[PDB]
Structure 1
Amino acid sequence: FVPMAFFGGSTGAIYRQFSITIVSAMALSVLVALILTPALCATMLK
């Protein structure tokens, strides 16, 4: 996802936008995966 935020030029800041949102959020996914979903699973399930 990141190598497109490195386009530069008039485009670049078009893509740079996508890249950022996706690579953030995706980290918040990995972060949440380890905190919310592990508990909250073992707090409600089966």
Structure 2
Amino acid sequence: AVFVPMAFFGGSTGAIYRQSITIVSAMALSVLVALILTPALCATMLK
């Protein structure tokens, strides 16, 4: 919500402060990838 509030758009600048969302999807996928997986790989193999 630094991002999506700003992605509530206004007029001809519609898809401009909008497509955040592109970058919130990116945030929640990096959270996902990190809540899953990174846990795995880190354990699986490191030193």
- Unpaired segments of 5 or more residues in structure 2? none
Mapped to 1, the partners of 2:11 and 2:21 lie a distance apart of 17
> Is 1:33–2:34 an aligned residue pair?
yes
In the TM superposition, what is the alpha-carbon distance from 1:7 to its structure 2 partner? 2.6
The answer to whether the Cα contact below 8 Å between 1:4 and 1:15 also exists between their aligned partners in 2 is yes
- Unpaired segments of 5 or more residues in structure 1? none
* Partner SS, residue 42 of structure 1: helix
Q: Which runs of 4+ in 1 moved over 4 A?
A: none
Higher helix residue share:
1
* TM-score normalised to structure 2 length: 0.79
In the TM superposition, what is the alpha-carbon distance from 1:36 to its structure 2 partner? 1.0
* Partner SS, residue 31 of structure 1: helix
